[PDB]
Amino acid sequence: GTCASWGCVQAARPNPTQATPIDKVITDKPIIKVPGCPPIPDVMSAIITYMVTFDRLPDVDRMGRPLMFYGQRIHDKCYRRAHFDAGEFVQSWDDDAARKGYCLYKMGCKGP
Amino acid sequence: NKPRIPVVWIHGLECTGCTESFIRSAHPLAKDVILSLISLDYDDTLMAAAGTQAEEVFEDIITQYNGKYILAVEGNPPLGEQGMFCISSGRPFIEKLKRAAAGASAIIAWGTCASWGCVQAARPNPTQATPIDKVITDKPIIKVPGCPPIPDVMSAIITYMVTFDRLPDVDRMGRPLMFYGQRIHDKCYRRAHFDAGEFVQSWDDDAARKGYCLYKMGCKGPTTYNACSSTRWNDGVSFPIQSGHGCLGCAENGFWDRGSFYSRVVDIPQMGTHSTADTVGLTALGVVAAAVGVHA
Amino acid sequence: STQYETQGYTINNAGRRLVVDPITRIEGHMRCEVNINDQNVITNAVSCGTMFRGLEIILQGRDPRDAWAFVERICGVCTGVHALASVYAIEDAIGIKVPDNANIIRNIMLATLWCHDHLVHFYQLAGMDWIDVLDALKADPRKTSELAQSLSSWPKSSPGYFFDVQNRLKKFVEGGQLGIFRNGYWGHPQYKLPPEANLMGFAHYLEALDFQREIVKIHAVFGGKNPHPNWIVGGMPCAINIDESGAVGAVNMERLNLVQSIITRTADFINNVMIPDALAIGQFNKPWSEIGTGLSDKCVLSYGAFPDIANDFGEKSLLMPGGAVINGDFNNVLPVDLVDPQQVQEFVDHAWYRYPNDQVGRHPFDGITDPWYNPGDVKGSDTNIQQLNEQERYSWIKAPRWRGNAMEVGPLARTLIAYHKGDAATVESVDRMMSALNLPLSGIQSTLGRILCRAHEAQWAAGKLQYFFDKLMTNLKNGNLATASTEKWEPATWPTECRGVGFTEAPRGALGHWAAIRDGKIDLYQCVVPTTWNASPRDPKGQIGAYEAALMNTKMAIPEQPLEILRTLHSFDPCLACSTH
Amino acid sequence: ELAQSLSSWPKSSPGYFFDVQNRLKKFVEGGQLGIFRNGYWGHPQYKLPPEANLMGFAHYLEALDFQREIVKIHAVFGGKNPHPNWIVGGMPCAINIDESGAVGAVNMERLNLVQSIITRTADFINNVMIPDALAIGQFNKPWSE
Ligand code: SF4
Ligand code: SF4
Ligand code: FCO
Ligand code: F3S
Ligand SMILES: [Cl-]
Ligand SMILES: [Cl-]
Ligand SMILES: [Mg+2]
Ligand code: NI
């Protein structure tokens, strides 16, 4: 998750407790970051099965995240991309746009 | 208790893929549809009675429940050879169809077969297979196309009609707006790649292994109305594009005769953002490299 | 009145004529007619395919790479098998070799189909021939529980559970809306299960109807959707990516995890529900180990299937053995060649087609599909068949023969072939299975035996699923990921003129596609399908096909109630759209 | 026999409990007791007969599996579980039953899924959890004080 990977909610301003991600504390061990709040259930298990079956750590990006599930962005595989590029957006909750499943970019989607 | 609405399910020329799809339903299970939502009173694929016993059931249902049953039609009637390309009880199937439709309140046309004609109607249509709406003209017909339609779409349409006690709203073509209102291409999770100009060019290239768009492999998503890209197949496990093959266009009328499945769709606007901007950059970089004298 | 002798049978069409049209709980359209003597014994049997679409005609002129998609629509029940045969044929013609993973996945697609198809047929199609559904309302739940728990380790067996099932059924019928159970054959003297066995059977019918939807999820992963998954000439389109960026867009670890979960559950359901139910039906219907033998003790055929060595369709590769037996000589299993013009041939003298000379058979490379509806005098009219004329043309199904011999195909045929070729697993399996019923090996050559062999095949296929999956994972562990060969994808790389054969064992038997390519287009495409063999009409020698043979000499307890006819026909698992295409 | 005396639940065959017992026996025979290691097993306050313990443990496994299904209702209306999504002013899951683009909203098919989960959840709770709670009650009555 985001907690061990980055810091997550407790590390947000003003981080009252000085919550620190693991890789800031442990610096002499291979650390596989599986972020998300929480990560996808089947992603968690697929990573586990991979390590058991293939007897190796998954290849990771420059941030220590497994390329298999974190190599691309949400926006790169979102089924509402057709609306995004067409400029078809939900502008307020439960408008006709929302009822047709238009893009949520103007509602603040951080998929990109 | 409560009576369930009587349903008569007849079969013309078909592959029985639509019936198979129906029983794949994840929610509600086909078991519960048959047990609790409807009364499946006639269906050659599943019923115990055969022959003259089957005929008696058929006659009894359409007579007793005349004007009150739903007619579900899988497959289509052939007009060739006086209709004897499809024979039921020693007579042309079309006679059964007409007799069934005359007493129905409404008709469901399951799949591309009943809706349009599907594979048997492809060039040269040896049997003159004809969609239901070309034969029956005086009854509401709801077209639920696809080869076959999505299992959960089928059941959802059934549950809708039971629960809301009415027919689903339809386009000019008779397809339910709910699942056929939009194109595969307008809800495809690979649009990002389409829009960027990132395409699979040959099977199992690096593009294919990253799940890039299948437009250049012949995907007919851009011209096909269906729910496969949102609802998905077999309890949302997958759909054609997700498993690496382009849409064949199987929900669309005469899709068999729209050229090769591996031929690109035409008259679909397509200008990639990153493909165009990469060109613009190299065009400009190459113009300058020529003038400076570091060409190539 | 006519009478003649063939294959040990005396075909006599004197006496009362019985017509079963439509045949229900089958795929597609079939009509059966029989004659019975004074002793209510069948003396004449007529198998009629009452549908035709003409796929072989539709494919002419098309691109060989599109072929699989057209022919897949031959049948939605055995969905996928025709597509497999198709890519086999086109790859054979052009000379394409697919990568190992592509072969393994295709094997998985076939095994999955076997599991699903056999399971659904057992319960939803053949089942109500053996299970008296309405009699289940008379059972005692506590003994139903005892019975089930005495037969299997399946968890779902509580008295409360069976009581719930019986209760729903009771409610269902109480309204008079019997649905699929209306006007059935309930109470027929040939229904031999005790009420407790009927309740157990019906409960499992429901469990199978539910679970079957899960099995095909394997098709959805590798082929996008079921029914009618997708395939490509050169391999499979389901690219694999385990450990690299963008694995989210391909077959990844999570995807394979799903496949593995379905395999385990499928083997679990087949082994502990279907298998014990099959044995159970055998226990209470032992006389039917001697009814509907037909051609199964005389002539059986298998092409073979499941090549474990990629692109090798030889005997050292096929996990499901091929071969032919004729004249009841099972000690001499003969090799099959689908190119040999003297082996597989199709006759149309008793079918609604046209040949230059209907007195000779044509190998599919010389095949002709020219529809000619010509029923003769049928005691009615061209649009009103009261009685088929079996003297002449009576079916949309062609009459295939092997070296002139009428053959039975399917699970029973394959089992006999595999057994007599000395396949250790099959020998043991059959032996074990027959021991349990206290029946001789000959008991398998029957209506009951077909059903028993089908169930055993499902178990066999379920086991193979795991084997293939492990084989795939082994490749991935070794970094072997390739799923497609595109070296010869472009028509420009094809021979100007070529031909090939694609064959496999479909759920219902030996399937073959014969394809000729000329200038990048389909020139000829001919299909000989399993039900084409079994439901075959007669040939110029008057030899009868597997259905008509199996129905011969059958005793009927009530002539107007064709339960016996149904039992035998359903044991073959007729797919009529397959047979006619 | 114990399970069947307490509930209508179908999963109660001798073969089933034997299988569960074997899986557990195999599991421990390796010395790798996992979450069971250094437990309080054999404590005098443990009052269930061996059969009730086997029934209980089997149901523990069944609950572990089935709990994942319940939260699918959260996934439909709130996108994901754990931590579904909400908005001030209502819920973001717009509903479309009968109009074009229903594929992009909560539709009949989505609702059908929700209904299927509700039925299964009530069925598990009423016939597994409830009787087990009642059973623990029967064998641990002093703890009512
Ligand atoms: S911005 Fe968000 S809603 Fe819009 S297409 Fe991208 S990921 Fe989807
Ligand atoms: S062309 Fe096909 S793969 Fe590409 S975005 Fe459109 S529907 Fe998806
Ligand atoms: N199994 C099956 Fe269908 C038939 N006959 C095919 O091939
Ligand atoms: S081929 Fe048919 S299944 Fe959907 S993806 Fe295209 S409409
Ligand atoms: Cl299950
Ligand atoms: Cl459950
Ligand atoms: Mg043919
Ligand atoms: Ni078939």
UniProtKB/Swiss-Prot annotation, chain B:
Residues 1-278 are periplasmic. The chain crosses the membrane at residues 279-296. It comes from Escherichia coli (strain K12). [4Fe-4S] cluster 2 binds at residues 185, 188, 213, 219. The gene is hyaA. The keyword Transmembrane applies. This is Hydrogenase-1 small chain. Coiled coil: none annotated. Heterodimer of a large and a small subunit. It catalyses: H2 + A = AH2. It comes from the Bacteria. Belongs to the [NiFe]/[NiFeSe] hydrogenase small subunit family. Its cofactor is [4Fe-4S] cluster; [3Fe-4S] cluster. [4Fe-4S] cluster 1 binds at residues 15, 18, 113, 147. Its EC number is 1.12.99.6. One of its GO terms (molecular function) is ferredoxin hydrogenase activity. The chain holds residues 48 to 343 of 372 of the full protein. It is an enzyme of class 1 (oxidoreductase). This is one of three E.coli hydrogenases synthesized in response to different physiological conditions. HYD1 is believed to have a role in hydrogen cycling during fermentative growth.
Swiss-Prot record, chain D:
It comes from the Bacteria. It is found in: Cell membrane. This is one of three E.coli hydrogenases synthesized in response to different physiological conditions. HYD1 is believed to have a role in hydrogen cycling during fermentative growth. Heterodimer of a large and a small subunit. Belongs to the [NiFe]/[NiFeSe] hydrogenase large subunit family. This is Hydrogenase-1 large chain. The lineage of its organism: Bacteria, Pseudomonadati, Pseudomonadota, Gammaproteobacteria, Enterobacterales.
